[PDB]
Amino acid sequence: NLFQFGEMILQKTGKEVVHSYAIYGCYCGWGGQGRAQDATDRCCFVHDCCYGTVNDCNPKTATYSYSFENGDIVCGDNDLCLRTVCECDRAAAICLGQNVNTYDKNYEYYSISHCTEESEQC
Amino acid sequence: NLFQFARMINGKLGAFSVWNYISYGCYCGWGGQGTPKDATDRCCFVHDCCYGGVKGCNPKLAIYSYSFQRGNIVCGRNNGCLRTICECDRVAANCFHQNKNTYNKEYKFLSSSKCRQRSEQC
């Protein structure tokens, strides 16, 4: 669920999701249209499409099993769906961490006046 | 998509209102476990269940058709799952508006520790 995805994100990026990625770009925040603005934003679009592949459980509320081990994120579930959501969240947190170096505060609340162009497609 | 849901919120409650729902309660925004804390929270829980009932598509990325008519949100001519998704958002935005008098600031930004109940069932 999103509380767990928010934990993964803090652990991997140093950032509290609710004050940062949650309002960011055209995809990380309340978006889902226009062009991905940068690498962080693209990671989020990738994670949207990932969620897109999830049919049998709700990725927003499915509570999965994970831990951090040596800097890695380990998804521990059996139920294939729980695990598939966990792996979505893991990859995106790993991707966010890989691109925090170009986090740009100027993309915070960008969807109010932008994201109006061709959208990304999965 | 969330860009549209955010405008439905803003159009019903006022400019910038969407940002009040980024993280509130156990369900609104970056959360998704335990007992809803209040009516506003339950609005979000219902919307999560409404999105979880959507099969064959991806509400985060869906673009549907809607407008405001006399102050009120109206879902346009949406076919198949688009109709379902627009309606999920319509209901939830209207729910937020109707409960804005119980919105309580102290519920913004809960950590998952406050939401460790077995999650309400859809």
Swiss-Prot record, chain A:
Q: In which tissues is it expressed?
A: Expressed by the venom gland.
Q: What class of enzyme is it?
A: hydrolase
Q: Which reaction does it catalyse?
A: a 1,2-diacyl-sn-glycero-3-phosphocholine + H2O = a 1-acyl-sn-glycero-3-phosphocholine + a fatty acid + H(+)
For this chain, the annotated S-S bridges are C26-C115, C28-C44, C43-C95, C49-C122, C50-C88, C57-C81, C75-C86
The protein's matches in SUPFAM superfamilies, at most eight in alphabetical order, are given as: Phospholipase A2, PLA2
Q: Where is the protein localized?
A: Secreted
Q: Which GO terms describe its molecular function?
A: calcium ion binding; calcium-dependent phospholipase A2 activity; phospholipase A2 inhibitor activity; phospholipid binding; toxin activity
Required co-factor?
Ca(2+)
The similarity annotation says:
Belongs to the phospholipase A2 family. Group II subfamily. D49 sub-subfamily.
Q: What is this protein called?
A: Acidic phospholipase A2 RV-7
From Swiss-Prot, chain B:
Q: What is its main location?
A: secreted
Q: In which tissues is it expressed?
A: Expressed by the venom gland.
The record, for InterPro entries, names:
PLipase_A2, PLipase_A2_Asp_AS, PLipase_A2_dom, PLipase_A2_dom_sf, PLipase_A2_His_AS
Q: Which cysteines are joined by disulfide bonds?
A: C26-C115, C28-C44, C43-C95, C49-C122, C50-C88, C57-C81, C75-C86
List the catalytic residues.
Answer: H47, D89
- What residues bind Ca(2+), as annotated? Y27, G29, G31, D48
Q: Any binding details for the cofactor?
A: Binds 1 Ca(2+) ion.
Provide the coiled-coil residue spans: none
**Pfam families referenced in this protein's UniProt entry, alphabetically:** Phospholip_A2_1
**Which CDD domains does the protein's record reference?**
PLA2c (cd00125)
Gene Ontology cellular component annotations, sorted alphabetically: extracellular region
Q: What is its EC number?
A: 3.1.1.4
Q: GO biological process: any one?
A: lipid catabolic process
Give the location in the cell: Secreted
State which residue ranges cross the membrane.
none
**Reaction catalysis annotation:** a 1,2-diacyl-sn-glycero-3-phosphocholine + H2O = a 1-acyl-sn-glycero-3-phosphocholine + a fatty acid + H(+)
Q: Which keywords fit this entry according to its UniProt record?
A: Calcium, Disulfide bond, Hydrolase, Lipid degradation, Lipid metabolism, Metal-binding, Neurotoxin, Presynaptic neurotoxin, Secreted, Signal, Toxin
What are the recorded GO MF terms, alphabetically?
Answer: calcium ion binding; calcium-dependent phospholipase A2 activity; phospholipid binding; toxin activity
Which cofactors are named for this entry?
Ca(2+)
Function noted in UniProt = Heterodimer RV-4/RV-7: acts as a presynaptic neurotoxin.
**Binding partners and assembly:** Heterodimer of a weakly toxic basic protein having phospholipase A2 activity (RV-4) and a non-toxic acidic protein which inhibits its enzymatic activity but potentiates its lethal potency and neurotoxicity (RV-7).
Family under the similarity heading = Belongs to the phospholipase A2 family. Group II subfamily. D49 sub-subfamily.
The molecule here is called Basic phospholipase A2 RV-4
This protein's species is Daboia siamensis (Eastern Russel's viper)
